[PDB]
Ligand binder design. Structure first.
Ligand SMILES: N=C(N)NCC(=O)N1CCC[C@H](C(=O)Nc2ccc(Cl)c(F)c2)C1
Ligand SMILES: *[C@@H]1O[C@H](CO)[C@@H](O)[C@H](O)[C@H]1NC(C)=O
Ligand SMILES: *[C@@H]1O[C@H](CO)[C@@H](O)[C@H](O)[C@H]1NC(C)=O
Ligand SMILES: *[C@@H]1O[C@H](CO)[C@@H](O)[C@H](O)[C@H]1NC(C)=O
Ligand SMILES: *[C@@H]1O[C@H](CO)[C@@H](O)[C@H](O)[C@H]1NC(C)=O
Ligand SMILES: *[C@@H]1O[C@H](CO)[C@@H](O)[C@H](O)[C@H]1NC(C)=O
Ligand SMILES: *[C@@H]1O[C@H](CO)[C@@H](O)[C@H](O)[C@H]1NC(C)=O
Ligand SMILES: *[C@@H]1O[C@H](CO)[C@@H](O)[C@H](O)[C@H]1NC(C)=O
Ligand SMILES: *[C@@H]1O[C@H](CO)[C@@H](O)[C@H](O)[C@H]1NC(C)=O
Ligand SMILES: *[C@@H]1O[C@H](CO)[C@@H](O)[C@H](O)[C@H]1NC(C)=O
Ligand SMILES: *[C@@H]1O[C@H](CO)[C@@H](O)[C@H](O)[C@H]1NC(C)=O
Length: 337
């Protein structure tokens, strides 16, 4: 019979030893060997409150990824050191409670993150979470089981980030083609405009429910730095900055074929870890391709709309805890009393 507590967690994964990919190397020396068998138990007739915005597991994961990137993705300049090209493809990470501690997991299929949960169970580990770092769009995550879910520590307060949990993924295919000749930094992502705009209309329809039927408008970000005005993400080791203006086109339809986002590979990065600007080596040679699932969106809601008929939303990002938070929302650690 538990109690809300914070225990230092431990990680488990199916990482391959002697693999050159940095996620496998970190998981091999930092997550449990052992090869565990965690198990579930339904808590019959039981209800419990959750808060995905006040979750210590979020900061536990955040400590891991920061440690993983510092050991694996070293910048040439911060400090003037080595910076080799590395193998980079995130793998799932499971988080597990030690003895005397359990994770409580919400099985409500329309759970929004905060509040009471009816289908509560106790598990030893979380599901496999891929630690994908990105802005504006959440990549390669899990999908909402039933409806599109709007997540917010408080949807009335405009200062609190919103996580849109898509119930169906939209594939985005980013490439920096090969061939000493030309701007080797130019890149691009291709998206199905028909697919994407169908989902964006469903997000628009779901946002309308929350804001007493109100013209929902999308505006590319003004404030913030390159990594948050642009859709940012690491692909095979390289830092990608993609202009997402075509995705938040309030127009869209003579406009629903293949959308091509212009991208760039950047060398000097304002680190998501807070540690400032850091410079990496120029792009590797050859075809750099990543095909990912868009599984969520990060939005800010403009202020000063209480006397209008419109709500205006902008793609956000910047705090990676929101990314971990988007996959850990159904969990909470509790000390077994
Ligand atoms: N200053 C404080 N308190 N925290 C750091 C901060 O304030 N940050 C916002 C300022 C810049 C940073 C960013 O998010 N960098 C980034 C880099 C590469 C990729 Cl792939 C990505 F998704 C994101 C993070
Ligand atoms: C989430 O659901 C709970 C139900 O108890 C509600 O109190 C809260 O306002 C909801 N938040 C959002 C953003 O839907
Ligand atoms: C709880 O979730 C399980 C699967 O996770 C499923 O049978 C159903 O959605 C719920 N069942 C009960 C008994 O609450
Ligand atoms: C992408 O989503 C599809 C279905 O939406 C899923 O079957 C597939 O495993 C996902 N891929 C990744 C890398 O998550
Ligand atoms: C996703 O959610 C919307 C409601 O927001 C619903 O209309 C749509 O049918 C759902 N799609 C799937 C594939 O379940
Ligand atoms: C959410 O929004 C505002 C806080 O500024 C207020 O109207 C409301 O009571 C808040 N509720 C919670 C649970 O934070
Ligand atoms: C992704 O785009 C590249 C460049 O156009 C292409 O060669 C590759 O086949 C695409 N991937 C898929 C799965 O279509
Ligand atoms: C784009 O998505 C629509 C939505 O169903 C689909 O019918 C169409 O085949 C897709 N286009 C391509 C080129 O895959
Ligand atoms: C409610 O929003 C819809 C768009 O989904 C719009 O067509 C309709 O006119 C709105 N209703 C009112 C009363 O403004
Ligand atoms: C992104 O691209 C669109 C059109 O491709 C352009 O209108 C917009 O100015 C670009 N964003 C920035 C910050 O330059
Ligand atoms: C998403 O997963 C796919 C398949 O596992 C992989 O090819 C791709 O590189 C991943 N995307 C990112 C941004 O890590």
């Amino acid at each position: 019979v538990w109690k809300d507590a914070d225990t230092t967690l431990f990680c488990a994964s199916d990482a391959k030893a002697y693999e050159t990919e940095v996620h496998n190397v970190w998981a091999t020396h930092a997550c449990v060997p052992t090869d565990p068998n965690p198990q579930e138990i339904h808590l019959e007739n039981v209800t419990e409150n959750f808060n995905m915005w006040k979750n210590n597991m979020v900061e536990q994961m955040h400590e891991d990824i920061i440690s993983l990137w510092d050991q694996s993705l070293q910048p040439c300049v911060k400090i003037k050191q080595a910076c080799p090209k590395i193998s980079f493809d995130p793998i799932p990470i499971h988080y597990c409670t030690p003895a005397g501690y359990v994770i409580l997991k919400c099985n409500d299929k329309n759970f929004n993150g905060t509040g009471p949960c009816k289908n509560v169970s106790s598990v030893q580990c979380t599901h496999g979470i891929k630690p994908v770092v990105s802005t504006q769009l959440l990549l390669n995550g899990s999908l909402a089981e039933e409806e599109i879910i709007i997540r917010s520590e408080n949807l009335t307060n405009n200062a609190k980030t919103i996580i849109v949990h898509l119930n169906k993924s939209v594939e985005i295919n980013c490439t920096r083609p090969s061939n000493s000749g030309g701007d080797i930094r130019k890149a691009y992502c291709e998206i199905n405009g028909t697919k994407w705009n169908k989902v964006l209309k469903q997000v628009t329809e779901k946002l309308k429910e929350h804001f007493n039927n109100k013209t929902i408008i999308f505006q590319p970000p003004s404030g913030g730095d390159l990594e948050i005005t642009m859709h940012s993400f690491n692909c095979r080791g390289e830092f990608f900055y993609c202009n997402t203006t075509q995705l938040f086109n309030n127009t869209c339809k003579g406009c629903n074929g293949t959308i091509t986002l212009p991208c760039k590979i950047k060398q000097i990065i304002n680190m998501w870890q807070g540690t400032g600007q850091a410079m990496y080596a120029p792009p590797i040679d050859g075809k750099i391709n990543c095909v990912s699932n868009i599984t969520g969106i990060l939005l800010t809601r403009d202020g000063g709309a209480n006397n209008t008929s419109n709500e205006t939303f902008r793609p956000g990002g910047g705090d990676m805890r929101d990314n971990w938070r988007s996959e850990l929302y159904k969990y909470k650690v509790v000390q077994i009393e």
